From a paper:
Ubiquitin-specific protease 47 (USP47), a member of the USP family of deubiquitinating enzymes (DUBs), is involved in diverse cellular processes. USP47 is widely involved in tumor development, metastasis, and other processes while performing a more regulatory role in inflammatory responses, myocardial infarction, and neuronal development. The crystal structures of the catalytic domain, in its free and ubiquitin-bound states, reveal that the misaligned catalytic triads, ultimately, become aligned upon ubiquitin-binding, similar to USP7, thereby becoming ready for catalysis.
While the cUSP47CDC97A did not show measurable binding, cUSP47CDC97S showed a 1:1 molar binding with KD = 1.1 μM ± 0.1 μM, and this mutant led us to a non-covalently Ub-bound structure. The crystals diffracted to 3.0 Å resolution, and the structure was solved using the free cUSP47CDC97S described above. The resulting map showed bound Ub, although the two Gly residues were disordered at the C-terminus in Ub. The β-sheet of Ub was packed against the Fingers and Palm regions in cUSP47CD, making extensive interactions. On the other hand, the C-terminus of Ub was bound in the narrow cleft between the Palm and the Thumb, leading to the catalytic site. Leu71 and Leu73 of Ub make extensive hydrophobic contact with Val180, Phe300, Phe302, and Tyr468 of USP47 and the backbone of Arg72 and Leu73 of Ub forms H-bonds with Asp179 of USP47, in addition to the 2:2 salt bridge made between the guanidinium group of Arg72 of Ub and Glu182 of USP47. Both BL1 and BL2 were twisted toward Ub in a concerted manner, with the tip showing significantly larger movements (>8.0 Å). The α5, α6, and Zn shifted by approximately 4–4.5 Å in the Ub-bound structure. Together, Ub binding appears to induce considerable conformational changes in the SL, BL1, BL2, and Fingers, which positions the Ub and realigns the catalytic residues into place for catalysis.
Residue numbers in the entry:
A (entry chain D): 78 to 120, 132 to 171, 178 to 329, 381 to 456, 463 to 492
B (entry chain C): 1 to 75
Write the structure that this text describes.
Amino acid sequence: IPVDENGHRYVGLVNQAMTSYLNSLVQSLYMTPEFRNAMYDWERKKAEQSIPCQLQKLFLLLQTSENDSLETKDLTQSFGWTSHDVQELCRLMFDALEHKWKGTEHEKLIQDLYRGTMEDFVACLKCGRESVKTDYFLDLPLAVKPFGAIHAYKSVEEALTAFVQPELLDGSNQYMCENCKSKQDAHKGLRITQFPYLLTIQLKRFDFDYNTMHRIKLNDKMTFPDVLDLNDYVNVCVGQPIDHAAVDDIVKTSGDNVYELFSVMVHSGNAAGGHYFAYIKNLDQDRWYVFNDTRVDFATPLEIEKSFGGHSNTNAYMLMYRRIDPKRNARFILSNQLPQH
Amino acid sequence: MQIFVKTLTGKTITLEVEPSDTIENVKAKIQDKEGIPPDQQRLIFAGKQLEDGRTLSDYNIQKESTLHLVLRLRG
Ligand SMILES: [Zn+2]
């Protein structure tokens, strides 16, 4: 029987029309300890339309309501909708929170939690001069099939290395070096200088076809572990069972950037339009659950691994990690200490 | 004047644009370079998504900047 850490029965979300991605995004955010606790710290006509207020109400009901399922109609009304992806949805919620939190202590909270830091370099080969500029990133889009590649990347780490791989600019796309005073061959590339606290990584499983002009889904196999070591990026294996603090220390010693998987956004069905659900892990309970619209159940490591790929062709398209820091990693606020009633 | 775009495959291409050009013209040049409809394009710069109607100066996109192209998922 699914139970939360405070002994509360897990609650699903009603699938009104086709909005399974909304449920998966809310259950992921509501699962994020720092993001949920942030929500509780936040404080004639009445403005129900406030996306922060409705998101706060939905989190409160998701935690302290003895009901079968919760309706996201109020949250959709806050958006201003009458009958559209998940990333654009996440941008609308975050920007509405950032706008409401201006002047508040939580003004730069989405930055401190989800923003990463990298640098883009362009090195002209004739001059031998490199131009580096600082750039940030919220999510991390990784490619699956670098077409035409006969073999797609088998693991997330291999996609990460290819993302930070210096690529050569061809004659059609040559770099305009000012010192060269002409178009020139150059090395283009990106390298990560810092990872965000809450690592949001996206898999490019949806590709486009030239002849038919119809999008298609790439069900190629891509693996990801529960523990992620990313210390080599800043200058068969199974991890779905419960974690170990000792293996964390042995990798901690040779590197300080280790992350823990806690949310697995998967998609099943047709490429143009299908169904979305998520395998979510309680960071305080150390247990894997499955959130699928109104139905919330336990999750076995087998069905989480079975979604890597290989042919209803259900595969994960977005993964959520959190940095393993013993002091910064927070826990969900118990219901009793809330000063909001 | 010349900015980079990391397409869906990951291979980065170049584009010639004016700072006064709107983002819709930029997504139109992505169509000429990649054959991808502009309705399906979603451009991300410095983690912030670029919205239609705003120029490149609104986002302070300078020369040699790198935009990220991703597809809109549906369902
Ligand atoms: Zn040069």
